Amino acid sequence: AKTMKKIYVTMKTLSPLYTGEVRREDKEAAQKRVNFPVRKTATNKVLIPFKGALRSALEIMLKAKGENVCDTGESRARPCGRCVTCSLFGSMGRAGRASVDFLISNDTKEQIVRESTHLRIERQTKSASDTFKGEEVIEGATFTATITISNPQEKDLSLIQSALKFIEENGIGGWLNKGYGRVSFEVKSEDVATDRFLK
Template sequence: MGGEYLVFELEAVTTSPVVSGEIKIERQEKTKVKLARITGDGRVAIPIYGLLRGYLEIMLREKGENVCDTGAKNAIPCAKCVLCDLFGSLEKRGRAIIDDLVSVESYKDIVNTSIHLRISRQSGTVSDTLKLDEIKEGAKFVGKIRVLFPKERDKELILAGLKAIEEFGLGGWITRGRGRIKFTKIDIKKKNWSDFLRMAQEELKNIKL
């Protein structure tokens, strides 16, 4: 087992508009629009690390397992439970390396700025407006999850977390119907660290020294 690792290759499509906030302060401060997160090469990124762990915490606590509640105020991961082992804690690196989902198309092709109105319940007039980026329906995303030194439950846990994301959504405003996504492909591959040596040997054949 020590020489193996798992790779989950993911493909997904949005089935409703998705709100995924920007984390770069300098970019956010340049506009009054709540921006979508964008990569260096102009694509949209949706993080799933926190959601995976959060949904799994709910599932396992419901089963009676003793796992952390990282969503609680001032929570500090215990570094001992099954989810700290997989996702990590302040004391110990996790075994799961979880990439953001990244759009196949560019930001400008799949993101629209929408205006949401706040209506006063007393007067019936517009009291405020909010501008935000929304990723449109039908946008395709890809991503990878790698799990080092795999253990028996890893595949079950990762898949269960992805199923929960499909059911409950991701990003902002999920209680208003935003954030729905469908995983159209989940491939799981078992690989070996020695594969890198083989790849290097093949590449060296084409390099003239």
């Protein structure tokens, strides 16, 4: 269309944050120092996957509401192409309107990422059975992303904001059960013209 929706998303981290490293060379280079590296850029920043978290949040809440929304989290499941999340994030037939970025941090790894030590306390004897060192992202670290909706509808900002409140409720990535990833979001959207750069 002639308009596009830009949602600038700013994350402030409230709890410790972990998202594990996925590059095999970087992870294997970090296993000689930490047992759980943070997913990190080659420009020494931190990136978090964001499209899957928003899609999982919206699918859980819209399945709870009773809408006809598919579950693309099941093993090799195919999206049907008629859901609202299928229109937003994508389907096998057509791509999604929302173009979610990675959550690149505003700070370099030496300023927000710290190396911590977790243990396994035995139930009797209260001793350290196992001990592992993992990397984490500190509290107060700021991340930025831009969600880009190509064909905006009236319910695109509301569902993205509801999914962001669900991500604030449950956590963004990594060890969500132990208390990691509890964050907060600021949203500054703007409907920009598609022919803006031409001039």
